[PDB]
């Protein structure tokens, strides 16, 4: 829409993730073994291993009506639910598709009697929403695709005026802002082809598919204190039967220490990936988990060898050394999804606990600058 | 210097015109760049005439045009089917849509045909230097006059400019973060888009106008023999005296030895940057002119003391000016451009020659490398 949803419906954004630590085996970066050794080794026995669908991050408010979603929320357009997302956007430029989308939840939960079962008129859901393409995105087509002067060219000689105004002495980091806008521009590029094969254009909302994976909170309640076992098999129970739209999501408990349950994960993964797929995500068992003092990634991204070769491009390769640089990396990206995915929680049990809504955003706004740090994009 | 930046087939980059030199500083009062060191520039060099031809907003372009795709194959080597390119001074192509470059080629190969170039130059190909300018289809005349007309200038999109700089230096009163972050993330297109709307405001070729000022090459033959009189003359009679997408270029001749000649070419200058233009370029009389085993500058630029603003900043008439003057120390831009005509020049006599593809891209390369030298932007 150009502009972020109503700051009433953004209580919660959803955490960066960490990948796992580079595979020793040859021609591989990433692979299940270094992802269940993380969580075997800080004392976590058991984990849960989801299919990462292709493939958008969407967060998902329903309320039961208009008036809640006044009263609860204190939005004033009339509207009876959101679909936004990771950055705070409504997903679709249209009211209509969105909506429509909303009600599609809200009979579900209807004939599910999940708000009695809950106590609650308004829930949120952690959601990937397909198909991937189906999510606006004007980088490449304004950037690669200009109806007049070339994109690029236009950016050039923008470029050069800028660094003429630079040099003013009424005002040097400037080179950054073109590399980390091309690279962004670039990376999109990538994205396309790696979910090319699992795009599809939508007419209609009967395209899309919708697989949420957590059932954050309802009134009263934060689920971060439900293993994640309850989160797929409630969402389930509650969504997933009736209706076509909603999706179950792939799971498998795997036990980190049983060398033949890690080995029928690995086999799982392996599968997932053939097509150039992207992976799983491993979670541990319990939403929130402690080793002593120090807390534990909460997931960590698998993913396939032929979607990352896309990614990185396949004329990457390379290399054993840059490898090292990689782990560095790799350290930094934790530490960032530990503090995100705390301040995206306590934003959660603010707004829950009826707290000033500027408290919550407070957290909320934490997340999206976190995101602002500079990080390996690919990762 | 890639290949990435042309997205164009290769076959067709046989040329890259070099940058070009400011003129040296003035002396006259509230000054920084004045017609009577560029006269002096050449006159000091033993050469007596000079063209100056007017510079109007836009680019540079190079336009290649064959009389049919048939020709391009073999003439050219070119695979991709086109029959003709219109790319930048960087490389670049100039349209991202090629129905939109193919129809501004097609135009200038009709105005050709009907002028019968191609019989006299007993050519089927030729590669234009010209200015590609921004047209208002509406007011069907040139955006700048009717920027000019009621006192907008580049000043608009310098503002701009400075307002991103600014943004990016610092990178309820939690609130103004969450739009103000939403702003940060998107505002480098900000930036871009309002240099797009005032620059290049283009959807269809009726917005754009080509006004060549070289002939560079056609069949057996580097037109770098040929005096610039020539090339505006035959320009003019070949590619202008068309009611069409071809503009004349506005030039006068200057005796930089008479007096009253160079009063002449003073007031020409001054009337255009009144208004006013970016000013002129001031060439030697010909092509090429070697005084002593040394070249002189094939082009040395005279720009607007009011355009300059836009370049410098507002503020650059106080002085301060003084700094100016002294400050350049355009040596290395001398040089650099110098270096870059001939390779340009290298490029088309490999070419006209039929050398290898391989022989020709590497004076080409050659000038991008050129261009990658660190250099104040201003020049």
């Given at each position: 829409?150009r502009?972020?949803?109503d700051?009433?419906?953004?209580?919660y954004?959803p955490?960066?993730?960490?990948?796992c630590e580079?595979s020793?085996k040859?021609g591989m970066?990433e692979?299940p073994i270094?992802?269940?050794?993380?969580f075997?080794?800080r004392?976590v026995?058991?984990?849960?291993?989801?299919?990462?669908h292709?493939?958008?991050r969407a967060?998902?408010i329903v309320?039961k009506?208009?008036?809640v979603?006044?009263k609860?929320?204190?939005?004033?357009?009339?509207?009876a639910?959101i679909?936004?997302t990771?950055t705070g956007?409504?997903?679709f430029?249209?009211?209509?598709l969105?909506?429509?989308l909303?009600?599609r939840?809200?009979?579900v939960l209807?004939?599910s009697?999940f708000?009695?079962?809950?106590n609650?008129?308004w829930?949120?859901l952690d959601?990937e929403?397909?198909?991937?393409s189906?999510?606006?995105?004007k980088?490449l087509?304004?950037?690669?695709s200009?109806v007049?002067i070339?994109?690029?060219?236009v950016?050039?000689e923008?470029?050069?005026?800028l660094?003429?105004?630079?040099?003013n002495?009424?005002?040097?980091d400037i080179?950054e802002?073109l590399?980390?806008?091309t690279?962004?521009?670039?990376?999109?590029?990538?994205y396309?082809e790696?979910?090319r094969?699992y795009?599809?254009?939508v007419?209609?909302i009967?395209d899309?598919?919708?697989?949420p994976?957590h059932?954050?909170?309802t009134?009263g309640?934060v689920?971060?204190d439900?293993n994640?076992?309850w989160?797929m098999?409630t969402?389930?129970k509650?969504c997933?039967?009736?209706?076509?739209l909603?999706?179950?999501t792939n799971?498998?408990?795997?036990?980190?220490?049983?060398?033949?349950?890690?080995?029928?994960?690995?086999?799982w993964?392996?599968?997932?990936t053939?097509?150039?797929g992207?992976?799983?995500v491993?979670?541990?068992?319990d939403?929130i988990?402690?080793?002593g003092?120090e807390l534990?990634?909460?997931?960590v991204?698998?993913?396939?060898?032929?979607?990352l070769?896309?990614?990185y491009?396949?004329e990457?390769t390379?290399?054993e050394?840059?490898?090292?640089l990689?782990?560095?990396a790799?350290g930094?990206?934790?530490?960032?999804a530990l503090r995100?995915?705390?301040?995206?929680?306590?934003?959660?049990?603010?707004?829950?606990r009826?707290?000033?809504?500027?408290?919550?955003h407070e957290?909320?706004f934490?997340v999206?600058?976190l995101?602002?740090?500079?990080?390996?994009?690919?990762?």
């Amino acid at each position: 829409s150009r502009f972020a949803a109503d700051p009433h419906w953004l209580i919660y954004l959803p955490p960066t993730m960490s990948p796992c630590e580079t595979s020793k085996k040859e021609g591989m970066l990433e692979h299940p073994i270094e992802a269940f050794e993380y969580f075997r080794t800080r004392g976590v026995g058991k984990v849960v291993c989801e299919q990462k669908h292709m493939g958008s991050r969407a967060v998902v408010i329903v309320c039961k009506d208009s008036q809640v979603a006044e009263k609860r929320f204190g939005v004033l357009d009339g509207t009876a639910g959101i679909c936004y997302t990771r950055t705070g956007r409504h997903f679709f430029d249209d009211m209509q598709l969105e909506a429509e989308l909303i009600d599609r939840v809200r009979k579900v939960l209807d004939k599910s009697g999940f708000w009695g079962d809950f106590n609650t008129d308004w829930v949120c859901l952690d959601c990937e929403l397909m198909p991937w393409s189906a999510k606006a995105q004007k980088l490449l087509e304004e950037q690669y695709s200009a109806v007049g002067i070339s994109g690029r060219v236009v950016l050039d000689e923008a470029v050069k005026l800028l660094k003429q105004a630079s040099l003013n002495k009424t005002v040097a980091d400037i080179n950054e802002l073109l590399q980390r806008f091309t690279e962004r521009s670039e990376m999109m590029q990538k994205y396309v082809e790696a979910y090319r094969k699992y795009c599809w254009p939508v007419n209609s909302i009967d395209d899309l598919k919708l697989a949420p994976f957590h059932i954050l909170a309802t009134e009263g309640k934060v689920h971060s204190d439900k293993n994640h076992i309850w989160h797929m098999d409630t969402i389930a129970k509650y969504c997933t039967q009736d209706d076509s739209l909603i999706m179950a999501t792939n799971h498998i408990l795997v036990d980190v220490t049983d060398a033949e349950s890690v080995d029928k994960g690995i086999k799982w993964w392996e599968d997932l990936t053939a097509s150039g797929g992207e992976g799983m995500v491993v979670k541990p068992y319990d939403f929130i988990v402690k080793n002593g003092r120090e807390l534990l990634q909460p997931a960590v991204k698998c993913r396939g060898r032929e979607y990352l070769r896309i990614i990185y491009g396949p004329e990457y390769t390379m290399d054993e050394n840059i490898e090292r640089l990689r782990n560095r990396a790799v350290g930094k990206k934790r530490s960032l999804a530990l503090r995100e995915f705390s301040l995206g929680m306590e934003a959660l049990e603010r707004f829950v606990r009826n707290e000033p809504l500027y408290r919550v955003h407070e957290c909320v706004f934490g997340v999206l600058a976190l995101e602002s740090e500079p990080v390996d994009p690919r990762l």
